[PDB]
C-alpha cells in the first residue's frame, strides 16, 4: 500500500504535467505552423506533405517521392539573366524517374525540388552557404560550387533534453528461515516419543 | 443586446476588432476557413459561402501520447505452509494427552 500510493501519486502528477505541457505547447505549434506550414504539416501528419495556410486551417497536398540518383546540382547560383542578382539556393535539374524529362528547378528546404525558380536575392561578398543535399550537405562560396560534404563533418549540437530511465532488474528471492522446524523440534532436551 | 451595432473586422481566435484595415490585394482561387464561434466559416472568392462544424475538418494532433495507469489495489490473504495445529500434530505421541 505504501509503495503503491507513492508511485500512483507521482505518476498521476506526471500524467497531469504531461497533459498540461502538450496543451501548453499547442500555442508554439500554432505559431510555427504559421511560420512554415510544410515542415509542421509533415511532422503532424506523419508523412512529407506540402502545406499552406487557408485562413485559420491548413491545406495539405501529398508530396511525391523522387530517388536521389535522378538529381544533379548545378555550379553557381548566379543567374546570368540578372546581373546584380543571384539565386538564394542552388539550382538543380531533376528527372522524376528514368525515361522522364530532365525538369529544371531549385533546391528547397529538407531536400525539396521546387519547380519555380523565383528565390532571387541580391549578390553579396562573403557568401558562404551550406544546403541539405541527400544525406549530407553541400557547400558554396561566392555563389559558386565548392563541394559536397557528409553530415558528420559539421559540429552537432543537441536541442534534445536527456532522460535516462533504466528498468528495475529481476530479483530472485530464495527460501530463508532463521530456524527450520527441525531445529525447533531438536531444541527440546528430551523427546517424549523418542 | 440593446447597444449600437458596431461594424468591425473579425480577428484571430474569435477576436472582434474595431478597425477594418487588414486589406490585401485580391487574388483568384480565394478559399478560406476562419474561426467562427464554435466552428469555422468558409468563404470562396471573397463571398460568404457557409459555416461548418469543427468535426467537418480532419484532426491532426500535435500532442505526444502518454498512457499512465495506476497500480491497482491488491489484497494479501493470510497464508501459512503449516499452522501451529499442524506442527503440534506432526508429533507421534503428545506427552500431555
Amino acid at each position: 500500500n505504501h509503495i503503491q500510493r507513492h508511485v500512483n501519486d507521482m505518476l498521476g502528477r506526471i500524467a497531469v504535467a504531461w497533459c498540461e505541457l502538450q496543451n501548453h505547447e499547442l500555442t508554439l505549434w500554432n505559431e510555427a505552423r504559421k511560420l512554415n506550414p510544410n515542415a509542421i504539416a509533415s511532422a503532424t501528419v506523419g508523412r512529407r506533405v506540402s502545406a499552406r495556410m487557408l485562413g485559420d486551417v491548413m491545406a495539405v497536398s501529398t508530396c511525391v517521392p523522387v530517388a536521389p540518383d535522378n538529381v544533379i546540382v548545378q555550379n553557381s547560383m548566379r543567374v546570368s539573366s540578372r546581373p546584380g542578382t543571384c539565386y538564394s539556393r542552388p539550382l538543380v535539374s531533376f528527372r522524376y524517374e528514368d525515361q522522364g524529362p530532365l525538369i529544371e528547378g531549385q533546391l528547397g528546404e529538407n531536400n525539396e525540388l521546387r519547380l519555380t525558380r523565383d528565390a532571387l536575392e541580391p549578390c553579396t561578398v562573403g557568401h558562404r552557404r551550406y544546403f541539405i543535399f541527400g544525406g549530407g550537405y553541400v557547400y558554396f562560396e561566392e555563389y559558386a560550387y565548392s563541394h559536397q560534404l557528409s553530415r558528420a563533418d559539421v559540429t552537432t549540437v543537441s536541442t534534445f533534453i536527456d532522460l535516462n530511465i533504466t528498468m528495475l532488474e529481476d530479483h530472485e528471492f530464495v527460501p530463508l528461515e532463521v530456524y527450520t522446524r527441525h531445529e525447533i523440534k531438536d531444541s527440546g532436551l528430551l523427546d517424549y516419543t523418542e | 443586446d440593446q447597444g449600437p451595432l458596431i461594424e468591425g473586422q473579425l480577428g484571430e481566435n474569435n477576436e472582434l476588432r474595431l478597425t477594418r484595415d487588414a486589406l490585401e490585394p485580391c487574388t483568384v482561387g480565394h478559399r478560406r476557413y476562419f474561426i467562427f464561434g464554435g466552428g469555422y466559416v468558409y468563404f470562396e472568392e471573397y463571398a460568404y459561402s457557409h459555416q461548418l462544424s469543427r468535426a467537418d475538418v480532419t484532426t491532426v494532433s500535435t500532442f505526444i501520447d502518454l498512457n499512465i495507469t495506476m497500480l491497482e489495489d491488491h489484497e494479501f490473504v493470510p497464508l501459512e505452509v503449516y499452522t501451529r495445529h499442524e506442527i503440534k500434530d506432526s508429533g507421534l505421541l503428545d506427552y500431555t494427552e
Partner: peptide, 15 residues
C-alpha cells in the same frame, strides 16, 4: 532524408 520530394502547391481538396 535520402529521398528527395516534389511538393505541388496544395489545394483545399484536403484540409
Amino acid at each position: 532524408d535520402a529521398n528527395f520530394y516534389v511538393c505541388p502547391p496544395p489545394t483545399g481538396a484536403t484540409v
